[PDB]
């Protein structure tokens, strides 16, 4: 996560999942399985979703590893959670990085 540029809070993308129950429950998570990431700044390397399962894997990680230590721990919801929150964000920094890893490079 040093060397990884903190995806400057996401899109916040709340999945919303289909149930306001999730929708809500994102908009709460939002601080853990949240609208954050950490990725390094790839013009799309035709392949962010590489980065990005690596993203989640630092994200979802530094939430629920270096953060479990203050008591906060994700369940394969709170990771469907990560994962469609931050799977599909840092998917969408594949083509969203593109951009913005075009625009600061």
Do not use: W
Request: aromatic share 14%; charged share 20%; net charge negative.
């Amino acid at each position: 996560l040093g060397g990884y540029m903190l995806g400057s809070a996401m899109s916040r993308p709340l999945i919303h999942f289909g149930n306001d129950y999730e929708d809500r429950y994102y908009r709460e998570n939002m601080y853990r399985y949240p609208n954050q990431v950490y990725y390094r700044p790839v013009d799309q390397y035709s392949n962010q979703n590489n980065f990005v399962h690596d993203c989640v894997n630092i994200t979802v990680k530094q939430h629920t590893v270096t953060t479990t230590t203050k008591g906060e721990n994700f369940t394969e919801t709170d990771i469907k959670i990560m994962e469609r929150v931050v799977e599909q964000m840092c998917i969408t920094q594949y083509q969203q990085e593109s951009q913005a890893a075009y625009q600061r490079a």
